[PDB]
Design a protein around this ligand. Structure first.
Ligand SMILES: Nc1ncnc2c1ncn2[C@@H]1O[C@H](COP(=O)(O)OP(=O)(O)OC[C@H]2O[C@H](O)[C@H](O)[C@@H]2O)[C@@H](O)[C@H]1O
Ligand SMILES: Nc1ncnc2c1ncn2[C@@H]1O[C@H](COP(=O)(O)OP(=O)(O)OC[C@H]2O[C@H](O)[C@H](O)[C@@H]2O)[C@@H](O)[C@H]1O
Ligand SMILES: [Mg+2]
Ligand SMILES: [Mg+2]
Ligand SMILES: [Mg+2]
Ligand SMILES: [Mg+2]
Lengths: 203, 204
């Protein structure tokens, strides 16, 4: 039957900026209905506010190939063998921009790729106990033979290497833990569940 | 093939805690190798530090059912129709605890569930451009006929309702966007790809 309560059932009293820099950390102060029939007291939660993202799975349906991008993610350092990760094309959505416009711009800047047809995959909350970030994933039709080399915007300290693999190879890398960031895991699991119909639609 | 550079190829010059409360915001300052050769200059990144988590997908292989937990996640408010989400059992890992230890404890606290066997699913970085958080997912064998009621630790303002649905319904809710938090999407997509073998393994 689904969830129990709606926005009618919670009041955000205030939000307090705990840190303001490139990103923000806010204290949300709120009350909400309880499953037992009552109202909570005032609850506070620290929430990391960093905007929202567009993610592109670049899929070549003729060749059954996936384009990955490699770059350092320093936050991965403490729990990973290397901070260089294999990821999906992705970037932050600015005010007034569409998910698909960001995906196309990032595909060109990060992988030198033009994108043909697109379809939505899924839009997800990265970690909603502590961050508001939502990421909207699209699959985009590409010619993987045009995906190669070193990209990224140097002026933003963005250094990116393109890798092309077969779809099955990419999914094996997920199973083995060689690809282990949420956006790429979600996109490539979706692709494993939908590739037959998608290849038929696009060929 | 695979990735190009290792930990030897980056120098973390310093870290600085910019805010500390329940969680922390750290500034990492570092230099790293470039693909075309040479080292970068000094780069700084703001990183949300909140520790790491264990996640449990409660699956009943006899009934082909999943147990979901519902609770408010106020951070979902601004981009969702409701901040109450349908999710996996999950909790933070404290020092010296294993993923499995935490998953089993949270299954009891959050859903009243005893867990039989467990198997690893995947361990993932939630959003590694801006947070260090890693979540390690297990699938856990449960009797979904025992899953009911309101749970959570009230001392922590944790109010949780249990829901039981078919695997197929849970997956359709992923496809429809009714379940849209990363841990649940990853776990339920994994289940959709592996359930036939898993049910055979656990009903022998
Ligand atoms: N943002 C916060 N600010 C302050 N206190 C908090 C916060 N989050 C939790 N607490 C306190 O800590 C207690 C337990 O936190 P719980 O509410 O069970 O969140 P989890 O443990 O399932 O989060 C685990 C994962 O799933 C989620 O998606 C997260 O994003 C993680 O990825 C609460 O009772 C609070 O008092
Ligand atoms: N933590 C940071 N601190 C400071 N500056 C930053 C930080 N992160 C990025 N910049 C600056 O912002 C610029 C690019 O940041 P964006 O638009 O987010 O690119 P992306 O791919 O990183 O984020 C998209 C998500 O896609 C994937 O799914 C991951 O989850 C990613 O987070 C860089 O020039 C940096 O200088
Ligand atoms: Mg990017
Ligand atoms: Mg970019
Ligand atoms: Mg929890
Ligand atoms: Mg808990």
């Amino acid at each position: 039957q689904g969830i129990t309560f709606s926005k009618n059932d919670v009041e955000i009293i205030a939000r307090e900026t705990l840190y303001r820099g490139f990103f923000s950390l806010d204290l949300y102060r709120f009350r909400h209905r309880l499953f037992n029939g009552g109202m909570s007291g005032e609850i506070t939660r620290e929430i990391f506010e960093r905007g929202h993202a567009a993610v592109l799975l670049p899929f070549d349906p003729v060749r059954d190939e996936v384009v990955l991008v490699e770059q350092i993610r320093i936050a991965a350092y403490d729990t990973s063998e290397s901070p260089w990760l294999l990821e999906m094309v992705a970037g932050m959505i600015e005010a007034g921009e569409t998910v698909e416009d960001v995906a196309r711009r990032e595909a060109l800047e990060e992988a030198g790729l033009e994108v043909g047809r697109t379809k939505p995959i899924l839009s997800y909350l990265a970690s909603p106990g502590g961050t508001s970030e939502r990421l909207s994933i699209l699959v985009g039709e590409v010619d993987a033979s045009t995906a190669k080399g070193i990209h990224g915007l140097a002026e933003e300290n963005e250094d990116i290497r393109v890798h092309v693999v077969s779809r099955e190879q990419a999914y094996q890398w997920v199973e083995e833990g060689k690809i282990d960031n949420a956006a790429s895991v979600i996109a490539l699991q979706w692709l494993q569940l939908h590739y037959h119909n998608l290849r038929n639609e696009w060929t």
